[PDB]
Design a protein around this ligand. Structure first.
Ligand SMILES: Nc1ncnc2c1ncn2[C@@H]1O[C@H](COP(=O)(O)OP(=O)(O)OP(O)(O)=S)[C@@H](O)[C@H]1O
Ligand SMILES: Nc1ncnc2c1ncn2[C@@H]1O[C@H](COP(=O)(O)OP(=O)(O)OP(O)(O)=S)[C@@H](O)[C@H]1O
Ligand SMILES: Nc1ncnc2c1ncn2[C@@H]1O[C@H](COP(=O)(O)OP(=O)(O)O)[C@@H](O)[C@H]1O
Ligand SMILES: Nc1ncnc2c1ncn2[C@@H]1O[C@H](COP(=O)(O)OP(=O)(O)O)[C@@H](O)[C@H]1O
Ligand SMILES: [Mg+2]
Lengths: 575, 577
């Protein structure tokens, strides 16, 4: 009895919060507990769902007396695994303690042993135990045992074995709905408020549940809700030393979630109106190229968030096309950086093999637990509120395109694992380099002919006609201009200047050098991708060599220019 | 048994806490909570987590923290005294319970137990009737008692997985190494003890230098301990190293040589006079490798950037994917690179780790996580030698899972072992050799006159290697086929190899200049690289010499002359003995 703690006695003295909800799940446990055989119940639920608390609720019902007379005199106990494994150091010493407790429980009838995290004690698992004594107590039917096990590790421990599954009844314990969860907070509000004497507004508690699931995406919302609430209350209790701000507002809860999320407060805060209003301004600040596309794309985002009365379909389905590395990927990453979401990257070129298609929605080789599962489907579940970047969509197998249609139309994807993804919030973007390839090729003729083709016709050849109708608007990048590329060179050198600033050496670049580096580095076929290679090997190699051994060890004071006749850069350094 | 930290601060025994404001504010907030009111400080050995519990009490007397946290006296338990003190039977229950009574009935009672893992169960051998962890859990569940934890990163995982209930009650707190500015400030508080005990005086430049010198060279130890370890050793050095000088002052020179011995690096390396090392590095490779001048330029320039510091500091010094034909010395140049640098080279074969089952071994231990300490083979190598050349032969053959791991190294240059210490590639040069370019265009173009049919360069490798991996790479060093003129230089070094072998047997070999030309042309094969030179030398020079060394005049050793007659275009050898 020393190892275990009587929950029934605990309720009499208090300290158990009144359970709210889960009336059907709680009633189910009592029904199975009254069975002649297989009375032992199981609670298959994820961490934070509230599977441990529902068992506590049963003890409260017994003390309250709102149960049949059979269970009115019954008692419940909670097995402490830590107490049993405290200092034994040998497997089998633990078992002796378990046997002694079973005899103590067996003498008195109407005793229930609530084994929390039953999966740990039974089964070999992955990351110890014997599991020899759990089987006889189940087959003997003397004392009922309530076992809480997660969905994961239950299929590999209970379904694999007949003895444990046969004596245990499975109770699906799903996460509560948003409406149900906010009601629970109201039930628990008097206990938390009494601790620090602060009053919570209805808006803040409702916002906490809604925002927590959207941003945290780590554990289930019931546990997350109580954490942010208690954290905000504790923070509010001691945040101002001089001022006792007994009142609470949405401002306080926003900062608390930002700290654990480690994301800027502005993004975490429910400032969707503010962020959407300045979405273009923030994006345009860092990147000043392709303003025409930004204006069309920025407006498409604001209207997309509204949904036009249709929300089941994915909010974002914009497709981008044009020359490679001319801003197709910069806008996507900068869009995520401004929003603060975690950008995901997948190259369809890599997934151009039928075996690779299976990798996206599962694992061809045998895996244990299917933890890796699909390369993309699992990532979507990990971060549903994040943008999905696809590269070289043109070079993909035909079957892959069929799967894409289901995402935009059906709004959900089913794979071998069976996990569901809420594509409503999910956004999608793609980049197509096929269009630039068509203009690069030369016709089979004595005199070449204009290869410029309408962007719409090019897509029809490589993409099915059943996709452009479901899309919002097509954005195409034709080519950069001299004024845009020239300005970009100035921005890129700043990174080198910032890098040199910490080292303690200054740098000076002539305007003529900047103009010359732009024409060579920029390529129509390859966009701005070779510009980084051209500019880096040109500037980095001479400066790096001199900086180590030479006059530029300390001081800097460099000068760069190019002779007109030579048309080649010249580097000057001052000690 | 227990010592009041709050009162110790008034006496002044504990040094005043500085910095770590972010950690402290987080701790008071979680402790303030109704539930989950037990902060757990998780870190590593030397991070300074122990000084936060003692440092926290110091702030209470000062009054900087909120009034609610004020008026709370923090006590500290003793792991050894409590267990050792209860030699008699049944004393532990009354003693631990009597001690609990002091904290009980007091809303402001606070308690700290360093190394919380030690008290998972304690003071009982025969039975588990009373447990240190579970004796305080029922009362703690009601919130009467609030405690503070302090455990290591790896050890925290054991309690977290084994006991989910305890994990809920304890709120994990991430601890990080203190800033360079904070480190020097902390050493000033400790400096009186070390300087007084050793009868030495530490200069302001010496203490500051140790912080940057140790992190640069010492690897396994952590920065607070690293700075304090060298300071203790540095003072001791003054007493014992100089017999007659008996210097009582610790200078930067006195506190930098110790870091060299502690790190087992060459003396004067802390001086950072690496300009000469990089000046002749390029020539050193060309002298032993002929025909890859282009690779040396691109390869040397990149290493120069990293040593010069022109680049992402987190990113490793270099990322390279050696590729080309067989026998072009892609592996040889890599080995010679380490020798010229004078840095130990760690070679790893990816063929053994071709499949996922063996990929574990490289990054972690097998299912017996605690059974085998080796864990990840790559991490301990870097930990043992943070400055090293890592060779990965036949990288393409490996499973794509390893490629995913390499992306992280290029992104931030960090890797974490499942059961071991942390490792970083900031000071490690990544070089992996692939055989994607070994394809040979054996077939020739149809027609009376052959035409150049060269496979497109770097296009095929795109399919073999993952696309995202290629984008992160700095440069790909392709190895061109050996030129005919280059062959002559390769032959010359093979004679030196043959010569040293012959010297052991007492034979001296003289080879004419025309002899080298014949061997070079006969054995020229671009498809087989330089390897045929060893075969033609083995076939034309070693074979006849072997017969004479065992069955002829060379049993005792002597002069040998090699030449070829123009009339027959065949080599003729002359033995003198
Ligand atoms: N009706 C309710 N439904 C769910 N949770 C509730 C409810 N009422 C209160 N809670 C609280 O919500 C939290 C639920 O935690 P649980 O999901 O039971 O934890 P757990 O799954 O046992 O955690 P582990 O040990 O980490 S798997 C506790 O703080 C409960 O007291
Ligand atoms: N450029 C070179 N200079 C000197 N020796 C060379 C050169 N290239 C190859 N060798 C010789 O080739 C042998 C080493 O071959 P490796 O460098 O291991 O082959 P590799 O270039 O990695 O190609 P494979 O496909 O792995 S055989 C030694 O005998 C070297 O001396
Ligand atoms: N508007 C722009 N302003 C500045 N740089 C740009 C702009 N658009 C594209 N770039 C540059 O184009 C390059 C794209 O590189 P990368 O991401 O490898 O291209 P890709 O995704 O086509 O393979 C980066 O250097 C990026 O900064
Ligand atoms: N004000 C301070 N802030 C942080 N650390 C400090 C401070 N004062 C001293 N220290 C250092 O804190 C360290 C505590 O080490 P500790 O956490 O006990 O190590 P371990 O985790 O290996 O047991 C000591 O090295 C001590 O010098
Ligand atoms: Mg090789």
């Amino acid at each position: 009895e020393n190892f275990t703690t009587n929950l029934n006695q605990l309720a009499r003295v208090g300290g158990i919060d009144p359970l709210i909800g889960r009336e059907k799940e709680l009633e189910r446990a009592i029904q199975v507990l009254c069975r002649r055989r297989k009375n032992n119940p199981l609670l298959v639920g994820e961490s934070g769902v509230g599977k441990t608390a529902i068992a506590e609720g049963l003890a409260w019902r017994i003390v309250q007396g709102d149960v049949p007379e059979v269970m009115a005199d019954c008692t419940i106990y909670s097995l402490d695994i830590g107490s049993l494994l405290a200092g034994t150091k040998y497997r089998g010493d633990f078992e002796k303690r378990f046997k002694a407790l079973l005899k103590q429980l067996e003498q008195d009838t109407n005793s229930i042993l609530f084994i929390d995290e039953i999966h740990t004690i039974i089964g070999a698992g992955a990351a110890v135990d014997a599991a020899n004594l759990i089987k006889p107590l189940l087959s003997s039917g003397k004392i009922r045992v309530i076992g809480s096990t997660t969905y994961q590790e239950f299929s590999n421990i209970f379904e694999k074995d007949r003895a444990l599954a046969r004596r245990f009844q499975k109770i699906d314990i799903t996460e509560p709905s948003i409406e149900e969860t906010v009601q629970i907070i109201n039930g628990l509000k008097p206990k938390y408020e009494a601790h620090h004497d602060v009053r919570y507004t209805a808006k803040a508690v409702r916002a906490a549940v809604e925002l927590a699931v959207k941003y945290i995406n780590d554990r289930h919302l019931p546990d997350k809700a109580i954490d942010v609430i208690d954290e905000a209350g504790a923070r509010a209790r001691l945040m101002p030393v001089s001022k006792r701000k007994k009142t609470v507002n949405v401002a306080d809860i926003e900062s608390v979630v930002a700290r654990i999320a480690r994301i800027p407060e502005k993004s975490v805060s429910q400032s969707d109106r503010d962020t959407l209003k300045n979405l273009g301004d923030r994006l345009k600040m860092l990147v000043f190229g392709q303003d025409k596309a930004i204006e069309a794309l920025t407006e498409a985002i604001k209207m997309a968030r509204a949904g036009l009365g249709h929300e089941h379909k994915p909010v974002g389905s914009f497709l981008f096309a044009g020359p490679t590395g001319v801003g197709k990927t910069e806008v996507t990453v900068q869009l995520s950086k401004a929003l603060g979401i975690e950008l995901l990257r997948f190259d369809m070129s890599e997934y151009m093999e039928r075996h690779t298609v299976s990798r996206l929605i599962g694992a061809p080789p045998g895996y244990v637990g299917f933890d890796q599962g699909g390369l993309l489907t699992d990532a979507v579940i990990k971060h549903p509120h994040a943008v999905l970047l696809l590269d070289e969509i043109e070079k993909a197998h035909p079957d892959v395109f069929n799967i894409l249609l289901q995402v935009m139309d059906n709004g959900t994807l089913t794979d071998n694992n069976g996990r569901k993804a809420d594509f409503r919030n999910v956004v999608l973007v793609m980049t197509t380099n096929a269009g630039v390839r068509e203009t690069e090729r030369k016709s089979i003729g004595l005199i070449h002919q204009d290869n410029s083709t309408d962007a719409m016709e090019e897509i029809k050849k490589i993409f099915t006609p059943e996709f452009r109708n479901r899309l919002d608007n097509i954005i195409w990048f034709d080519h950069l201009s001299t004024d845009v590329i020239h300005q970009v060179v100035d921005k890129f050198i700043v990174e080198l200047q910032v890098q040199l600033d910490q080292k303690g050496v200054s740098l000076e670049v002539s305007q003529e050098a900047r103009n010359w580096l732009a024409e060579k580095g920029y390529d129509r076929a390859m966009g701005a991708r070779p510009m980084a290679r051209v500019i880096q090997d040109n500037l980095k190699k001479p400066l790096a060599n001199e900086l180590l051994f030479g006059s530029l060890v300390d001081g800097g004071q460099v000068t760069v220019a190019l002779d007109k006749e030579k048309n080649e850069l010249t580097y000057g350094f001052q000690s």
